[PDB]
Structures are given as C-alpha cells and as structure tokens.
C-alpha cells in the first residue's frame, strides 16, 4: 500500500482531447424549478453541464449542425462536493452555483377577512 502526496488527475487516461480538456468550463448547479409547474422534484440533484458552443444551420434541409462533442453531456451528482471532486479529477474548469431554496412563508386563511388590515380580499 503506497502513499502518494499528489492530487488525482486522470486527464491523460480519460482520452479527452487537449482542447476539450483545457478550454471547457462546466457549470455545477441545482436546476431551477420550471415556472409553468408547481412540482419541485427536479430541483433535488446537482447537475454538471458544459458551456454552449456554436450551432449553425445545415445548408441542406436547414437542420441544426454542431461541432461540440460535449453539447448534450449532462451529469447528475447527489452533492456539490461530489460534483466538484469529479470536475477537478477530470480537469475541466468549473463554476459552482449555490442552491436556492424558497424561504419559509407564513400562510393564513383568516387574514383574508381582516377587520382593519389591508390583507382583506375583495373577492374569492
């Protein structure tokens, strides 16, 4: 059992080209809840995605072409620390966004019929 005083770096073993190792900045973040729905089941796991590259229009049929292999690559991590460790050992740059959770709110149905406050509703 040898002891190594080194940081993990498997860039030479992953086989990724040097361009896509050096010139890539991933974004670690918890996905924002879709405003069209009230569900919150897609805001629990951290995601890692790469920066957007150029997409052009195919001369034939007008399709959407690309030259970025890592365009559709999205990875799921259960922890920000895990995502950061994975990005560090793979060698890409990373920008981390802190999770945003809604603050607690005091809801009261009886406030709709206040005697002297402005919270009284004009309709139901």
């Amino acid at each position: 059992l040898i002891a190594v005083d080194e940081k993990l770096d498997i860039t030479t073993l992953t086989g990724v080209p040097e361009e896509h190792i050096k010139t890539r900045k991933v974004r670690i973040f918890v996905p924002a809840r879709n405003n069209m729905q009230s569900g919150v089941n897609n805001t629990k796991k951290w995601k890692m995605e790469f920066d957007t590259r150029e997409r052009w229009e195919n001369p034939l049929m007008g399709w959407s072409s690309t030259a970025d292999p890592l365009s559709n690559l999205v990875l799921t991590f259960s922890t920000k620390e895990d995502a950061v460790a994975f990005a560090e050992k793979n060698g890409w740059s990373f920008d981390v966004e802190e999770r945003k959770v809604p603050k607690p709110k005091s809801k009261s149905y009886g406030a709709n019929f206040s005697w002297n406050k402005r919270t009284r509703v004009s309709t139901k």
Binding site: A3, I10, L13
Partner: protein, 114 residues
C-alpha cells in the same frame, strides 16, 4: 492515505518501466515502417514515438504512469502482430487535419472559438 499500487511502488520503478517501453517502441519502428509500407522515414516514426511519450511527461502519479505504460504495451502489441492497419499508424500523424490557428487574431477571424 495508503492506496493499492498497480505496479512500481514508488516513481523510480515507474520510470524504469517507461524506459523499457520506450526501448521496445524504439526497436519496433523500422519493422513497422517496412511491414506497413509506410511512406514516412524511420526518423519521423522515432520522432513521433518521442512526441507521444513526451505529452505525458507531466504525470507525477505512479499509478497513472503504470496505466499509461500498460496501454502503451497494448498498442505496441497491436502494432507488432499487425492487428492495426496502415490507417491507424497514419492516424497517429493527423496528415489530413488542417492546421488549426493558435493566435488570438486568427481565432477571432475564423469564428467564436475561445
């Protein structure tokens, strides 16, 4: 923290294995050129072997070096047994790739690449 070693224990034996692999690759270039009927020179093949060895010279982890020499031995045994074709041997040279510009002004002119 102690970790299970693949080979070589410390870095000295890893360097020894690297040198053994380099000798094996160096003595194989003339045979590869003769068998595959490559249009390159033997000096070009030796220089390409040197370049491929040198791009991993910044590795300071003995386990990563062991995996690198293992994969080098694999790709050498593919060449000796003529499992590879002239296609792959020439793929090592990127003879058809256009020279990618590297200066800021040229990169700005060509497109949106960083």
């Amino acid at each position: 923290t102690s970790v299970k070693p693949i080979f070589s224990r410390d870095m000295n034996e890893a360097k020894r294995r690297v040198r053994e692999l380099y000798r094996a690759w160096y003595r194989e270039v003339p045979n590869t050129v003769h068998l595959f009927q490559l249009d390159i020179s033997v000096k070009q093949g030796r220089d390409k072997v040197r370049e491929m060895f040198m791009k991993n010279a910044h590795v300071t982890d003995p386990r990563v070096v062991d995996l690198l020499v293992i994969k080098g031995k694999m790709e050498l045994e593919e060449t000796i047994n003529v499992w590879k074709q002239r296609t792959h041997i020439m793929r090592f040279f990127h003879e058809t790739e256009a020279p990618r510009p590297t200066d800021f002004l040229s990169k700005f002119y060509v497109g949106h690449d960083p």
